[PDB]
Amino acid sequence: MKYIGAHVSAAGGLANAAIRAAEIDATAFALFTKNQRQWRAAPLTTQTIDEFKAACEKYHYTSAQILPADSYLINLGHPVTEALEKSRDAFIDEMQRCEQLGLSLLNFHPGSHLMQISEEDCLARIAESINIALDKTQGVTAVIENTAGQGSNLGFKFEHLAAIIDGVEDKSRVGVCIDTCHAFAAGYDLRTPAECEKTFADFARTVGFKYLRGMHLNDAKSTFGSRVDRHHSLGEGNIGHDAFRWIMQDDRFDGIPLILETINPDIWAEEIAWLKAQQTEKA
Template sequence: CEEYGFSPDHILPHDSYLINLGHPEEEGLKKSRSAFFDEMKRCEQLGLNRLNFHPGSHLNQMSIDDCLDRIAESINLSLERTDGVTAVIENTAGQGTNLGHTFEQIARIIDKVEDKNRVGVCLDTAHTLASGYEIRTREGFENTFRQFDEIIGFSYLKGMHINDSKKELASRVDRHDSLGKGLMNMEVFSLIMSDNRFDNIPLILETPDESLWAEEIKLLYSLITHHL
C-alpha cells in the first residue's frame, strides 16, 4: 500500500468464492468458517481493515432466514477471533440459491452481527441490476439508494464494485461486462463518480478484460462532474 500510495481504507480484498458461511451441512460449514477466519486473520496481519465476501447459499436444504442467521453466526465467530478487520458483505445477483440479493436479507445479517462497528456492505453495480434494482436512470438510482439508506444505512457502505452487466434487470444472473459494453448505460457510473456519498471508499473494477482497465479508470475519472 505504501509503495503505491494507497491507504488501507482504499483496499478491499475478496475472499475465496468457495466459502459458504451459510452452508447447510456441518462439514461444509466447518470448512467455510475455518477458511473465512484464515482470510480475516491474513488481512489483520497485512494491516488491511476490511474483507469482502459473498454471504452464502442455502443450497435448497434450509430456509432463507435460517441460512441468513447462520451467516451472521459465522461472521460473529471470526470477529471474536480477529481485531481491526471489518467483514464486508457483498450484495449478490441472487443466482441459484445465493443469498444477499435484497437489501432486506443483508439487513437481517447485519442485525444479527454483534459488533456493528465491524460489519459493512459492498455494492456491486452488476449484481444490483441483476437482482432487480433499477439504477440506470437518475430516478431509479436515487430510489435504489434511498431504499439502501432506509433498510441498511449508508454508514455501512464500505466499498463498491464497478461493473457493467451482460444480463438484464432482475435476471438473477451474475455476468460482468466491460464498462459501456453491457446493458448498463454510462449515466449510472457518472452518478456514482459525482456523488459525495461514495467518496473515500474503495471503488473496485471487476470487469472481464484486463487490457481495458487503465482505459476504464480514465473513463470513470472523466465522468466526474460535480458533487450531488
C-alpha cells in the same frame, strides 16, 4: 475524495497487486490474498508481509483504499454442519491474513441455503459465521457484498444484508459492498438517474450508508432482473455509462474503494480515467 481501482491479479506475489494497481493509475485496489479456488495456502511470512506493506507504502495505498476478497469456496450459511465449519475455518484464515497484511476490510458473498434450509436460518448462520470471525481477529471489517441471486444464493435483497447485520454483535466491524451488476441482475434498476436515486434511497432506508464500505463498479452482460451474475466492461453492457457517471458525482460514495471487476483488464486504465473525469463533467 473518491478512490478508484480494479480487482488486480496477485500472480507472482501480493506486492505485484499494488504494482499492477499503480500501472493503471488506480487510487484503490482489490485482490485475493491467497488462491481463490483453493482451501488453504502457505502461512504469510515476515518477507511477504514486508514486501506487500512496502509496495502499498511506495504506491500510496492505505488500508482504507484496499478491498481484499475471499475465495469462491467459502459458504458462510452452508446447511451442512461439516461444510459450514470448513467454510468458517477458511473465512477466519482469510480475515487473519488481512490483519497480518495491515488490511482493514474483507469483501465476501453471504452464502447459499442449497434448498436445504430456509432463508431465515441461512441468514442466521451467516451472521454467526461473522460473529465467530470477529471474535477471533482484530481490526478487520467483514464487508458483505450483495449478489445477483443465482441459484440458492442470498444477499440479492438489501433486506438480506440488513438481517445479517442485525445478527452481528460488533456493528463496528460489519459493513456492506454494493456491486452494480449484482443489484441490476437482482432487480434494482440503475439505467436512469431516477432509478439510481430510487435504488440508493431504498438502500439508505433498509441498510444505511453508515455501513457502506465499498462498491463494485460493473456493467452487466445479463439483463435487468435476470438473477444472472455476468459482468461487462463499463458502457458495453445492459446498465450503460449513465449509472457510473451518477455514482461518481454522488458524495455518499466518497472515501471508499470503488472497484472495477469488469471483464476486459486491457481497458481498466481507460475505465479508471473516465470514472475520475466524471467528477468534473456535466450531470
